[PDB]
Design a binder for this molecule. Structure first.
Ligand SMILES: *[C@@H]1O[C@H](CO)[C@@H](O[C@@H]2O[C@H](CO)[C@@H](O[C@@H]3O[C@H](CO[C@H]4O[C@H](CO)[C@@H](O)[C@H](O)[C@@H]4O)[C@@H](O)[C@H](O[C@H]4O[C@H](CO)[C@@H](O)[C@H](O)[C@@H]4O)[C@@H]3O)[C@H](O)[C@H]2NC(C)=O)[C@H](O)[C@H]1NC(C)=O
Ligand SMILES: *[C@@H]1O[C@H](CO)[C@@H](O[C@@H]2O[C@H](CO)[C@@H](O[C@@H]3O[C@H](CO[C@H]4O[C@H](CO)[C@@H](O)[C@H](O)[C@@H]4O)[C@@H](O)[C@H](O[C@H]4O[C@H](CO)[C@@H](O)[C@H](O)[C@@H]4O)[C@@H]3O)[C@H](O)[C@H]2NC(C)=O)[C@H](O)[C@H]1NC(C)=O
Ligand SMILES: *[C@@H]1O[C@H](CO)[C@@H](O[C@@H]2O[C@H](CO)[C@@H](O)[C@H](O)[C@H]2NC(C)=O)[C@H](O)[C@H]1NC(C)=O
Ligand SMILES: *[C@@H]1O[C@H](CO)[C@@H](O[C@@H]2O[C@H](CO)[C@@H](O)[C@H](O)[C@H]2NC(C)=O)[C@H](O)[C@H]1NC(C)=O
Ligand SMILES: *[C@@H]1O[C@H](CO)[C@@H](O[C@@H]2O[C@H](CO)[C@@H](O)[C@H](O)[C@H]2NC(C)=O)[C@H](O)[C@H]1NC(C)=O
Ligand SMILES: *[C@@H]1O[C@H](CO)[C@@H](O[C@@H]2O[C@H](CO)[C@@H](O)[C@H](O)[C@H]2NC(C)=O)[C@H](O)[C@H]1NC(C)=O
Ligand SMILES: *[C@@H]1O[C@H](CO)[C@@H](O[C@@H]2O[C@H](CO)[C@@H](O)[C@H](O)[C@H]2NC(C)=O)[C@H](O)[C@H]1NC(C)=O
Ligand SMILES: *[C@@H]1O[C@H](CO)[C@@H](O)[C@H](O)[C@H]1NC(C)=O
Ligand SMILES: *[C@@H]1O[C@H](CO)[C@@H](O)[C@H](O)[C@H]1NC(C)=O
Ligand SMILES: *[C@@H]1O[C@H](CO)[C@@H](O)[C@H](O)[C@H]1NC(C)=O
Ligand SMILES: *[C@@H]1O[C@H](CO)[C@@H](O)[C@H](O)[C@H]1NC(C)=O
Ligand SMILES: *[C@@H]1O[C@H](CO)[C@@H](O)[C@H](O)[C@H]1NC(C)=O
Ligand SMILES: *[C@@H]1O[C@H](CO)[C@@H](O)[C@H](O)[C@H]1NC(C)=O
Ligand SMILES: *[C@@H]1O[C@H](CO)[C@@H](O)[C@H](O)[C@H]1NC(C)=O
Lengths: 125, 440, 434, 124, 124, 435
């Protein structure tokens, strides 16, 4: 059966991939309503920032999105099976937290170039 | 040669400080719970296997948020109530001597004063009783104690001060991590955790010295402190069994009221039917002695096997701080706890704690927002459970081998820390990357 | 065979409760706080749609009610508080020119009022209506002294109703019933969609409904349950009845300072003779109108029954008389000149009216308002577009004026509107597979 | 055309040709609070529907064709009745009880498809 | 390597390479109301534009070619004049009056394409 | 043969009016309701663009005006009300050690005021300036007791004009004109984009502008319409004029409890001689400064036109004198000594006498008033005059007089170079590309 929201936390990275949906569908879900209003607004802003970034990278509607940027051993040098079968996502995030911005920048560059190349091919036939 | 893969919906989080909201659980109460959002009676709790989370109850901002929400709810309740400014007059007062017993001597006064009526051009003579604690002699001339600080607002007679559980719920995008370890002492990693959306209805109980109507430890007394060897820090002790305490104000109170302006009804004690006796609380001796023995054993684990432990009274600097303050029946009690903390531990029959009653209340350590507590008609009896203690350590650098503990208390955030100790708020960070063998 | 296909933008809806907002075109109604509407708002007829309405469960009414009360109080928040006025008053009768209907109705009172300096007092003389004072034990006090705070309405802020358009938020729509001769409690075969309602004037009245919409063809009689004697009956007329109201006295208004920045207004005197306020209803129009009501009312009570009308039962003037705001003044008119019959050439009915300066609007206690007097002579003309009737409970049924629950006035203009939520996401089978 | 909801009540098959009309109209002291509350409400509803469509594998599409088979128990009507005689209002009532079943299946189908895509790309 | 509006004034062609920079900078004691209003508006404007790209079938792209032909009546300038000489501010002024027309055409084209996709998939 | 192509993120903007929020970085302006900005804000220069600015048609001005008034009221809202001071005052002159220049002006008043208990009254002696007190018919009342209630400013809150930065909401940007010698009404060839403005000090003054931005090269003379005699002329200087303002009298401040939770502050007495408040400027600097103004002013009026300065016309003190805050005290200085000369083709000074007033009706509102508590001891402040507000008299030898009039023009000066625009990321263009 389902483990619930964050139920997979602590499970291995390759196991937790089966719970991406449950953790995605749970996003966006006298007087003194101002606190409630401020909370509702913030939840929306965070949601949209993640969606905007995925859109920039070309990952419009997918929970799993592959990108043409190669992985650098300088960011993390581990076996493919260590990463997916032994480590969890909390650990992984700590191991590569110092490369977050460079990876994101590279992803944006790749998609931008790809859009230009697609436009040129459409023009040529 | 692997390419970077982007995943969304990843089960990770980071510590965060956000805004929480209340869930009432479904007419008038000081906590204004009608402004809260009703929730399901049985929120689902998700157990997290193989997850260890670092906790620190002393740096938990959820505590600060309750403190602020509680103060604000309190003020919203008083904001629309009777102003009672016209009562700050010179009073003519004598002692109530007609039928009191020895202990109650000089603690209750009979005052007369010239107060306004509905019509601006008319006045009335009013007689009322006041407790000694609220009336200060100037230069038979007295004034109310609040006159040289601020105006006093009368609490609304229809609004209850009884606590209603307030569950605190995280906003979307956030989650609350709960520590379940038996014997969790407030800090460090907690190997058994779970996720909840709302906390377990913490009650806004207001007290000093002793903690009332809280949760119990599952098996042993738990001692929690920021730094136990630092004598500047408080120690919070959670009990694994309740101690029943029976408090009363054993006098038949006849309540009277007048109008002091258009509307603006003022309430006061008219008189007392029968003889006068002091307020008090009853704690069984056997229960209390067993309870301390459990506490002493746990203290020795930090202060040394064969270390001598002595319990003593607090300093006399502040009436609220040095006594056990509570709001039984809508009246405010100030009980002397010395009978509970007078013992040296070296390896039907009850304790009676005398209590005073005060009507002018100045709470939350603020200055100038005094409240007048209306008297309560008839006779008041409350049964409460002591579910924890506040202690401070007092000693020097000398290795006397004996440590002394005193009740301490007085900082309201400690009551909140005691119950919120197991919760942490984190931000969900669903977006992230990892390498694999997939390329577009 | 078949597979699920998901469609977005599907034209369907569900009953819903959401918050509506104000829209419109220096007034008690806080118009400046509303957004302007488009000229000629778009209305879409829904072909082949039957909806179901129940006006008695309409929550638009509740919002209108709460918003109006809030605006009322917001208007008064910054105005002068006449707390210095709750004093012993020394009063005698005004006897200069009496019609014998006004005898005992107008009093000449004297009092010691505060002023700009804390050290000074004023001797102020003013006129009051009997309905605003009580005896203390010639010593009188104002009626609000033992129950409420009194706030003077700001002298420059008009009470005249301004049409207010209620608009649904995006994601919601307002359906309206165009079905003719529709009572509001069942299926409606003729429906259109709007984003905003027509402007509704927040007219306040107690027995007759003034300045509302009119029935398109015939008098429409509606109620939650016609056989229930505890319910009000709302009657919508298909023709207006014109009513001419006046307060035919030339009032000289005086003003004093009662403290820094404050001002108190009162009637100083009356020029000319003093006579009673009254309203005129033509007899012919009224009798035809009432006859139409009886005919339609028999539809529910029998083809051979007797219908009687009578004046209402006792209680406060708020419910026993017909009250309204005419040019800022507050009238309490006795409707017994009307509703006095049994059914089986410029003549008119004169309804006597009383005036009050201190009122407690919206059936509340603790919030009193002082309506300052108005300089000069007041006259207004209004349309009676409906009635609020109750019935008692033989061969004869008796109907009486009733009312006072303001939500029932609102229910009239809002009877044809419903708020629904748009639910654009739906699913249906087809032959498509990825 | 007819305008917003103009097709309501018309045959389902005809109504579906003008989905853009509704798609465009969606998301089109305390008084200020009431307006803020209204604006937030419109946004939240809009986003929840888009979130859900994304989960099911469609974004930016008014007609989302998927691979979940239709169950005769949800509705045993034939296509000509559904598309030529019934309206969308009637239909929504007819299958109201199966809304969550269908939604659950749609989420599962996309989950499997994303995993399968990842494997094929890595495979070659 | 220019900043947020640093591309302004460059030719239309040159500026096409900075779209990421402008796009990523969108959405990034009673003065809490003024803050909420600012927050809310940033979101509403953002969403309206995304909603429109969604309707046109350009969701998720900074550059989207479509099937609506260009009419010389809107502009008859040379392709090189437009891209290698004019800037975007100038272009926007030159075709300001045809904006509504073009947007309507874009929505119609996409709706037709979606219908056609559904039929093709059903046919196999 | 071209197709429509859609682009998103296009660097296009349109003029727009939106709501800005404050950032900045106790005191009235020092409040915790702004969001502190970066120590390193960025600015991007826009190459090959020109944009039109219009400082007159600019709603940033209106927002500062509204925000400042609102903040002002929030500060005073929770402070002690002084209604009890409207009792009748018994007053005589303070002539103890009075210079002739101050003869009269300062009065010794006494009155019956309430105390902590409702039942008791107390007698108080206090000193007042003539400008705050009017005659009843030896009996006087405070000037505001017939028009408005008065609130005491909280003694713990200073009127310090702490710089406040304004920031655009996301989706908007602020364009800034970097073109030197820009008048503020036409095209600006050198423009840059910022997210936030420089911090602006919300300085209150009536004739001369104090502690604002200084012009880079030449005196800049600007107005909505020079030809219109109904418009003000704003002049921005290249060098500051140093002005030294003082209140030489040593005031001793006393306070009284007037009711529970309330206390009133007042001047008890003066230690030492009673002398007139005053401001000094260097005579040489002032003569140079006007010469620079005249030289540029002639560009609009002719080289055959005489420019003659004159003192302003009468009216309420606020617009006939130069008013400012100075340590928290409110000064009203006579500038007639600065605008006496007619201009036709060292170690000396100009002393401006000043008056002090404690009852303030700021922003020209009626119905509100503030009581400025007196400040203990001798007060001095030194400030930089960076500009002037002048008006034309309205067929030879034009006359200019001081006037500030509407305070909106104070804000205009700092904001003359900023414009708010909305970013519009979508657009289309033809290209040879089909799906
Ligand atoms: C049902 O609906 C009808 C309308 O169909 C309402 O009747 C209107 O009621 C309003 C409010 O009382 C009337 O407005 C007033 O009109 C007066 C007319 O004066 C004229 O003549 C004088 C010269 O003697 C001119 O100076 C003046 O300009 C006019 O040409 C005005 O004098 C009144 O002004 C006063 O009040 C305003 C308030 O904003 C102040 O600003 C003014 O300074 C002044 O004190 C006012 O404008 C309107 O005329 C009536 N219409 C008709 C056709 O008669 C009914 O009231 C409504 N029924 C109910 C119960 O609400
Ligand atoms: C144009 O710009 C100039 C330059 O900024 C402004 O001039 C300043 O004006 C302020 C306000 O009048 C002056 O600030 C005050 O200075 C007093 C003296 O400070 C000296 O002595 C103390 C001794 O402890 C030293 O710490 C300090 O560094 C100085 O050497 C202070 O006593 C004042 O304090 C006030 O607040 C405290 C709060 O705790 C109270 O206890 C005090 O009693 C008192 O109320 C205050 O700090 C500042 O010194 C001036 N600068 C200069 C260089 O002279 C102009 O005012 C401005 N013009 C306009 C129109 O805005
Ligand atoms: C927590 O860790 C334990 C291992 O200590 C996990 O148990 C293993 O799960 C895999 C996958 O189902 C099995 O093949 C192994 O045989 C299990 N090992 C043991 C010793 O039982 C457990 O699943 C983890 N929990 C979560 C939520 O991931
Ligand atoms: C009212 O009560 C006070 C105590 O609060 C009485 O004062 C005390 O009187 C006893 C003698 O009976 C002395 O031993 C105490 O020292 C006094 N206390 C203080 C603080 O001085 C007072 O006499 C009583 N008044 C009346 C009229 O009975
Ligand atoms: C509460 O439990 C924590 C966790 O075991 C104790 O923290 C340890 O304290 C020792 C002594 O200072 C250190 O050497 C360890 O490194 C600490 N561990 C961690 C995880 O921080 C803490 O002292 C206990 N406190 C009380 C009052 O019992
Ligand atoms: C308003 O019209 C409705 C619709 O015809 C009437 O509703 C019917 O009332 C009877 C009782 O008299 C019920 O038995 C029917 O089931 C109701 N029908 C429907 C469709 O709801 C209603 O009585 C009319 N009311 C008035 C005052 O005219
Ligand atoms: C209402 O109707 C009455 C008729 O009773 C009118 O009263 C007459 O008014 C005229 C002048 O308008 C007088 O000359 C007559 O003497 C009045 N008759 C009586 C019986 O007194 C009254 O004017 C009408 N009022 C309005 C404005 O509707
Ligand atoms: C996996 O990593 C370990 C070290 O942690 C290494 O010894 C082992 O050889 C690696 N295996 C693979 C997959 O090459
Ligand atoms: C009431 O006022 C009178 C005034 O003469 C005074 O004598 C009396 O003592 C006052 N009474 C009280 C109870 O304060
Ligand atoms: C209503 O039904 C008729 C058939 O009776 C049909 O011709 C007409 O098009 C329908 N209306 C709509 C909007 O579909
Ligand atoms: C401005 O024009 C010059 C012309 O030589 C060009 O080199 C430069 O790149 C242009 N600036 C921008 C931002 O395009
Ligand atoms: C007036 O000044 C003299 C010094 O010339 C001083 O001794 C005296 O005390 C002062 N008197 C007053 C009333 O200020
Ligand atoms: C106060 O000074 C004025 C100056 O004009 C003078 O007329 C007045 O008589 C003086 N009053 C006293 C009491 O000296
Ligand atoms: C205070 O009140 C008394 C009342 O007898 C009056 O004589 C005296 O003049 C008043 N004092 C002042 C300063 O107004």
């Amino acid at each position: 059966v389902s483990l619930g929201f964050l139920g997979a936390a602590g499970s291995t990275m390759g196991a937790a991939s089966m719970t991406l949906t449950v953790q995605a569908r749970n996003l966006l879900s006298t007087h003194w309503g101002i606190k409630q209003l401020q909370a509702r607004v913030l939840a929306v802003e965070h949601y949209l920032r993640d969606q905007q970034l995925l859109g920039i990278w070309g990952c419009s509607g997918k929970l799993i999105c592959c990108t043409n940027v190669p992985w650098n051993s300088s960011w993390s040098n581990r076996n493919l099976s260590e990463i997916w079968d032994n480590m969890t996502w909390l650990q992984w995030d700590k191991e590569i937290s110092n490369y977050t911005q460079i990876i994101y920048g590279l992803l944006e560059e790749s998609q931008n170039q790809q859009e230009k190349n697609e436009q040129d091919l459409l023009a040529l036939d | 040669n692997l390419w970077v893969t982007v995943y969304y919906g990843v089960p990770v989080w980071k510590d965060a400080e956000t805004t929480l909201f209340c869930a009432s659980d479904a007419k008038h109460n000081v906590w204004a719970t009608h402004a809260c959002v009703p929730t399901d009676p049985n929120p689902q709790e998700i157990h997290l296997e193989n997850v260890t989370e670092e906790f620190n109850m002393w740096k938990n901002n959820m505590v600060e948020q309750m403190h602020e929400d509680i103060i604000s709810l309190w003020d919203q309740s008083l904001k629309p109530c009777v102003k009672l400014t016209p009562l700050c007059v010179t009073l003519q007062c004598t002692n109530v001597t007609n039928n009191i017993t020895d202990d109650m001597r000089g603690e209750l006064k009979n005052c007369s004063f010239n107060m306004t009526t509905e019509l601006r051009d008319k006045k009335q003579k009013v007689y009322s009783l006041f407790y000694r604690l609220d009336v200060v002699q100037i230069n038979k001339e007295y004034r109310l104690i609040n006159c040289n600080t601020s105006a006093i607002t009368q609490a609304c007679p229809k609004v209850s001060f009884e606590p209603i559980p307030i569950h605190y719920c995280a906003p979307a995008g956030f989650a609350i991590l709960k520590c379940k370890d038996k014997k969790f002492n407030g800090t460090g990693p907690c190997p058994s955790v779970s996720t909840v959306q709302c906390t377990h209805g913490i009650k806004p109980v207001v007290s000093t010295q002793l903690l009332l109507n809280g949760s119990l430890a599952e098996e042993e007394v738990i001692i929690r402190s920021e730094n136990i060897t630092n004598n500047a820090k408080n120690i919070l002790v959670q009990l694994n069994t309740p101690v029943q305490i029976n408090c009363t104000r054993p006098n038949n109170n006849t309540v009277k009221s007048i109008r002091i302006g258009p509307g603006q009804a003022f309430y006061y004690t008219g008189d007392i039917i029968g003889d006068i006796r002091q307020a008090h609380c009853n704690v069984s001796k056997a229960t209390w002695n067993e309870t301390l023995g459990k506490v002493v054993k746990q203290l020795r684990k930090h202060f040394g096997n064969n270390t001598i432990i002595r319990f003593a009274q607090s300093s006399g600097g502040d009436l609220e701080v040095t006594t056990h303050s509570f709001n039984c029946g809508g009246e405010f009690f100030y009980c002397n706890t010395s009978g509970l903390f007078n013992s040296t531990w070296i390896s039907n029959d009850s304790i009676t704690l005398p209590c005073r009653i005060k009507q002018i209340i100045n709470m939350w350590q603020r200055i100038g927002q005094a409240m007048y507590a209306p008297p309560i008609q008839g006779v008041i009896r409350c049964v409460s459970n002591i579910t924890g203690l506040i202690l401070t350590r007092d000693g020097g650098s000398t290795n006397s081998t004996t440590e002394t503990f005193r009740p301490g208390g007085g900082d309201m955030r400690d009551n909140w820390r005691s119950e919120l100790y197991k919760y942490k708020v984190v931000k969900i960070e669903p977006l992230g990357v990892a390498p694999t063998r997939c390329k577009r």
